[PDB]
Write a protein that binds this ligand. Structure first.
Ligand SMILES: Cc1ccc(NC2CNC2)cc1C(=O)N[C@H](C)c1cccc(-c2ccc(CN[C@@H]3CCOC3)s2)c1
Ligand SMILES: [Zn+2]
Length: 316
């Protein structure tokens, strides 16, 4: 039969595009392997006339693409791009509305934990290592968080419609960002066993699991010592742009101006709902596209963020 072809662009980073000639008789999958147009899988679909000019994503099948893919995503997981494209198909459909001057996500596909995380990332200082995140992030701040959310699902290995832990999610994001300059100095004191001082750098220097109160952490928190007689851990020094204090959800009261933002989780383990509370002129509770405003907030808080620069204890 007659041979008909169009020119298109393949890519892995939608930054470097390589001109290709495709045969309409054959499916895209036969010609380039797995292929995706805006997350849409066209691997088993024959080319149309409309497809001409358009940019398709493909798996790296040569050293050039593998090098290009690694530079953009700081990863070599063969499934990665398929998952990022799979998530993207769904994420584009979501509506991201600007709520209180910050981009958020109207609820769908259990996206409540992402919206919450996304609002958090707009309020704190974070330089992502991989250009893929840097780039999607910049656009996410502008009001187009589709790719940023898609990349987050691909990076966090989550499937659309599956709920996720906001702390676990942010832990992954920090692991892929520049926190090398972050430093923490915790002193532990036992009446029996003495004082032991430890230094934490990187993610371990901004996240903490067991209290929501930054001030409590500074005053000191009781922890079980090796001996079996309880000992007190307290914060001696903190160099970081923020800190994340996390604990199992409990009834907490947030006062205006004493924090940056918290994550409220209501419901049972792994099947709850997430709401975002921010401190500005007054307290702001952001639930999807819904916004509530109040002077005082009492709810089951599980994560609190606090902007910080340099802090040193006045203890001893
Ligand atoms: C949503 C989700 C997805 C995946 C995972 N898995 C990964 C963590 N490592 C693997 C966890 C999560 C989770 O539920 N994240 C909340 C903050 C949380 C964290 C810790 C404990 C609890 C609760 C225990 C009992 C409860 C009943 N409800 C309370 C009782 C008082 O107020 C509300 S919640 C919840
Ligand atoms: Zn001890």
């Amino acid at each position: 039969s007659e041979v008909r072809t169009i020119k298109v662009f393949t890519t892995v980073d939608n930054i470097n595009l390589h001109t290709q000639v495709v045969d309409m008789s054959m499916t895209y999958g036969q010609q380039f392997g797995p292929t995706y147009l805006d997350g849409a899988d066209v691997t088993k679909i024959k080319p149309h006339n409309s497809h001409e000019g358009k940019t398709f994503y493909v798996l790296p099948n040569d050293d050039t693409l593998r090098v290009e893919a690694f530079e953009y995503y700081h990863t070599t997981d063969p499934s990665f791009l398929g998952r990022y494209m799979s998530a993207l198909n769904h994420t584009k459909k979501w509506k991201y509305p600007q709520v209180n001057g910050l981009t958020s996500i109207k609820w769908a596909d259990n996206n409540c934990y992402l919206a919450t995380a996304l609002l958090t990332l707009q309020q704190i200082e974070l330089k992502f290592n991989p250009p893929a995140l840097q780039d999607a992030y910049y656009r996410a701040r502008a009001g187009e968080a589709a790719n940023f959310c898609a990349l987050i699902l691909a990076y966090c290995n989550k499937t659309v419609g599956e709920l996720g832990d906001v702390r676990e999610t942010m832990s992954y994001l920090f692991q892929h960002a520049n926190l090398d300059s972050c430093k923490r100095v915790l002193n532990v004191v036992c009446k029996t066993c003495g004082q032991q001082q430890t230094t934490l750098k990187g993610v371990e220097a901004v996240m903490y699991m067991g209290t929501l109160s930054y001030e409590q952490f500074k005053k000191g928190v009781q922890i079980p010592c090796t001996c079996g007689k309880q000992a007190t851990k307290y914060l001696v020094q903190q160099e970081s742009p923020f800190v994340m204090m996390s604990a199992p959800p409990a009834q907490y009261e947030l006062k205006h101006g004493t924090f940056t933002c918290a994550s409220e989780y209501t419901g049972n383990y792994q099947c709850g709902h997430y709401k975002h509370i921010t401190s500005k002129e007054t307290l702001y509770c952001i639930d999807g596209a819904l916004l509530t405003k109040s002077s005082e907030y009492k709810g089951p808080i599980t994560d609190v963020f606090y902007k910080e620069n340099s802090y040193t204890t006045t203890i001893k």
